[PDB]
Amino acid sequence: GYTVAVVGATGAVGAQMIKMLEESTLPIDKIRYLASARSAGKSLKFKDQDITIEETTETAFEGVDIALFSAGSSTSAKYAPYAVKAGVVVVDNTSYFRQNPDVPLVVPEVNAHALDAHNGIIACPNCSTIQMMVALEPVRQKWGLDRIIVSTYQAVSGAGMGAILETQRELREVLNDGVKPCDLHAEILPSGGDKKHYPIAFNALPQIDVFTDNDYTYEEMKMTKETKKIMEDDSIAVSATCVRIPVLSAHSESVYIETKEVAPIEEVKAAIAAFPGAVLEDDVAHQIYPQAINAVGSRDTFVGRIRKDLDAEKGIHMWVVSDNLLKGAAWNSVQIAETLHERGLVRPTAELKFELK
Amino acid sequence: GYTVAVVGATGAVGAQMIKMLEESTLPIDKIRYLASARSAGKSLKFKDQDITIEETTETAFEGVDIALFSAGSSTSAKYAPYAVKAGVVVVDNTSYFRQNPDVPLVVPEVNAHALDAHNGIIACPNCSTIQMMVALEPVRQKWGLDRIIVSTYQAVSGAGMGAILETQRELREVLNDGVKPCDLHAEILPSGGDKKHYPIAFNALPQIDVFTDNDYTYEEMKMTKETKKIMEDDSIAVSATCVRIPVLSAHSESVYIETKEVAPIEEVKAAIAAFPGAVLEDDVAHQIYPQAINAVGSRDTFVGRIRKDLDAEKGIHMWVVSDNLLKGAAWNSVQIAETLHERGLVRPTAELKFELKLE
Ligand SMILES: O=C(O)[C@H]1CC[C@H](C(=O)O)CC1
Ligand SMILES: O=C(O)[C@H]1CC[C@H](C(=O)O)CC1
Ligand code: NA
Numbered sequence: 226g227y228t229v230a231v232v233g234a235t236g237a238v239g240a241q242m243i244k245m246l247e248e249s250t251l252p253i254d255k256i257r258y259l260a261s262a263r264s265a266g267k268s269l270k271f272k273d274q275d276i277t278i279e280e281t282t283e284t285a286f287e288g289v290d291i292a293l294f295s296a297g298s299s300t301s302a303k304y305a306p307y308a309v310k311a312g313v314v315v316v317d318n319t320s321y322f323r324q325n326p327d328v329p330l331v332v333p334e335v336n337a338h339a340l341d342a343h344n345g346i347i348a349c350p351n352c353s354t355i356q357m358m359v360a361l362e363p364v365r366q367k368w369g370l371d372r373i374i375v376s377t378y379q380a381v382s383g384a385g386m387g388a389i390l391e392t393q394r395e396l397r398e399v400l401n402d403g404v405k406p407c408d409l410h411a412e413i414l415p416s417g418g419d420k421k422h423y424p425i426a427f428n429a430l431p432q433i434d435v436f437t438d439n440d441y442t443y444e445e446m447k448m449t450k451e452t453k454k455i456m457e458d459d460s461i462a463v464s465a466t467c468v469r470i471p472v473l474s475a476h477s478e479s480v481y482i483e484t485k486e487v488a489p490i491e492e493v494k495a496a497i498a499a500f501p502g503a504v505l506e507d508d509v510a511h512q513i514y515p516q517a518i519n520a521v522g523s524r525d526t527f528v529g530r531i532r533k534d535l536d537a538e539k540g541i542h543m544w545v546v547s548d549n550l551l552k553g554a555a556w557n558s559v560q561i562a563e564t565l566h567e568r569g570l571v572r573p574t575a576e577l578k579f580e581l582k
Numbered sequence: 583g584y585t586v587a588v589v590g591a592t593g594a595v596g597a598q599m600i601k602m603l604e605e606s607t608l609p610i611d612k613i614r615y616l617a618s619a620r621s622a623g624k625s626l627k628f629k630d631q632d633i634t635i636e637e638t639t640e641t642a643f644e645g646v647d648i649a650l651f652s653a654g655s656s657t658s659a660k661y662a663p664y665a666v667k668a669g670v671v672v673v674d675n676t677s678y679f680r681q682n683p684d685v686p687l688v689v690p691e692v693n694a695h696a697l698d699a700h701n702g703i704i705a706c707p708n709c710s711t712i713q714m715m716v717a718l719e720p721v722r723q724k725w726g727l728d729r730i731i732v733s734t735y736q737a738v739s740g741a742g743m744g745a746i747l748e749t750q751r752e753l754r755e756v757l758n759d760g761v762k763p764c765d766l767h768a769e770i771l772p773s774g775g776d777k778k779h780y781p782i783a784f785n786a787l788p789q790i791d792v793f794t795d796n797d798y799t800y801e802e803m804k805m806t807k808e809t810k811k812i813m814e815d816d817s818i819a820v821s822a823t824c825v826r827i828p829v830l831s832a833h834s835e836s837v838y839i840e841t842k843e844v845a846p847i848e849e850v851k852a853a854i855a856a857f858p859g860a861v862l863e864d865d866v867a868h869q870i871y872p873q874a875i876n877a878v879g880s881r882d883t884f885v886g887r888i889r890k891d892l893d894a895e896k897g898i899h900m901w902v903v904s905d906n907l908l909k910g911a912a913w914n915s916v917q918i919a920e921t922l923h924e925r926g927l928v929r930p931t932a933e934l935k936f937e938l939k940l941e
């Protein structure tokens with residue numbers, strides 16, 4: 226069996242990484258929980274066992290076979306290369322390594338083949354991208370993809386544990402204290418690292434991450450660039466609007482595509498139903514469609530509202546929902562680790578391609 | 583001055599109709615509040631005056647100059663034609679008459695000209711359509727519109743008082759009692775008239791109104807058909823996805839357009855800023871964009887996140903927000919009434935063009 230380390234064990238994704246590992250088939254002989262200095266010495270469960278949390282350092286990775294990182298891009302940048310030097314295979318949830326050509330950016334149902342040539346780091350895409358890829362890959366396989374326009378409805382847990390607490394507190398202030406939403410005080414959302422913070426309670430904030438030079442946010446640009454890398458096709462046109470709404474868990478997406486060839490809607494529905502990881506929930510006669518509250522706790526990605534555009538011959542609209550901490554993060558990561566195990570890919574990398582510090 | 587009746591005075595829109603009339607320039611000599619048998623005999627204020635609510639009937643409109651209806655499609659179908667027969671000019675918030683060729687479907691900043699030939703009923707479009715029209719008309723004027731793709735983020739007050747209360751109750755059960763959102767009991771949302779109801783708390787429901795036979799909902803198809811009528815151009819391709827989210831007031835929209843001519847973003851921002859009823863809130867260097875919580879209580883429509891598509895030369899994305907009970911409903915209606923007054927159009931219609939349903 227493996228020694229597995231969870232880096233960021235105390236965070237929102239980390240807690241789900243623990244659950245997904247507890248529920249995993251991976252043969253784990255030893256589990257280690259790593260976080261920051263302020264968490265060291267605390268205890269968290271692995272099943273029935275008490276695990277003492279350790280500080281993450283450049284020397285903490287000796288003897289580790291697999292490390293799952295979800296402790297912020299800074300932490301991956303600092304420590305993942307030391308892990309690789311120590312002989313670890315890293316699965317990274319952060320954005321840091323995603324566009325490095327030496328790093329596979331993987332959704333196992335779509336591009337598991339990219340794992341074979343890994344150099345010790347495998348990147349998990351962002352939540353919003355992952356669920357979109359699970360929904361769209363079976364369509365691309367049969368009819369191609371020319372363009373995507375997506376508008377998202379993203380849950381606050383994607384911004385971490387603090388964002389969840391901020392949202393709950395704000396809603397209580399409005400509902401219990403009669404505070405006007407526009408009068409609420411915010412400290413984290415829309416983006417912890419940006420200059421100004423705004424309430425999310427009873428609001429829709431069209432900003433996730435910070436703004437890039439082209440007036441799209443980094444979240445929107447990640448959907449664009451990650452799609453192109455995962456589907457191995459720079460010709461797919463992708464433009465996104467990424468919006469935070471008052472939901473704690475599960476992202477929803479209104480997704481428009483134009484295919485290369487006309488894709489009959491009943492065949493599109495069947496292709497999605499048949500695709501591993503995607504579940505068709507589409508029966509409008511009985512008001513059946515994906516819902517955030519129903520998706521929470523499931524590893525599946527749910528697709529419905531599938532219908533042709535009213536005018537564009539090759540246009541199709543749909544609604545895609547998945548738990549953003551599960552398929553959107555921790556489950557995609559554990560699934561990658563399970564796929565590495567299946568394929569005999571859990572072993573030290575000989576050539577170090579990642580600069581130390 | 584005018585005698586003005588508010589039909590549906592007690593509902594979510596009706597309360598804002600009252601506020602908008604209290605703040606109006608219209609010369610009002612007499613106000614009447616009409617509702618159903620449920621509220622008849624109760625009292626509501628107009629400014630400092632107590633007004634007794636009356637049950638709406640086919641004979642309730644004698645002496646009325648202007649009637650503002652927001653009491654559901656069936657109420658407009660039943661009573662608006664009797665109001666017209668009585669000599670009233672009706673401004674209707676419901677969907678009932680919107681697609682009738684004898685009925686102007688008006689957003690005053692866009693197609694006030696259509697009021698001139700009214701036949702006693704002027705229809706307000708749906709809230710989602712109204713704010714989109716305010717944002718897009720100044721763009722259409724200069725560079726044309728080939729297509730629109732819109733995804734909405736709609737507030738629950740659009741579904742009425744009961745839906746507001748349901749949303750508040752559900753959120754309290756989760757946040758104060760620790761109820762799982764899945765375990766919540768719903769009675770109204772997504773659509774009061776449909777067969778099944780779902781929680782809205784911590785959810786996003788991709789259903790507004792009921793489904794039509796093409797698998798789009800009636801709300802989505804209203805955005806399509808109303809856009810074509812208001813802009814007087816059946817060639818504009820419009821497809822919509824309409825989603826309810828946990829917001830009490832103000833709808834937000836992610837709007838994609840393709841123009842006929844390339845429309846430089848800096849010029850688009852200036853055109854929207856200059857357009858009556860539209861306010862540019864777009865300064866990403868300082869994280870300025872429209873927000874539902876800031877739009878509440880304002881008659882303006884706020885537009886930002888304006889940017890060109892990454893690939894389509896003529897594509898533009900934006901974010902449009904307005905208070906759905908104000909510009910989306912009560913303010914559009916009062917603004918129409920003020921515009922009728924300005925144009926000398928408040929007077930009886932001789933020829934009845936609408937079927938009477940209570941004979
Ligand atoms: O993984 C990433 O690049 C981001 C991490 C934070 C996420 C959020 O704020 O919802 C968005 C994606
Ligand atoms: O005015 C209309 O046709 C509809 C009335 C109900 C509204 C809602 O449920 O938010 C949507 C628009
Ligand atoms: Na499937």
Ligand code: NA
Pocket residue numbers: 727728729817818819
């Ligand atoms: Na067109």
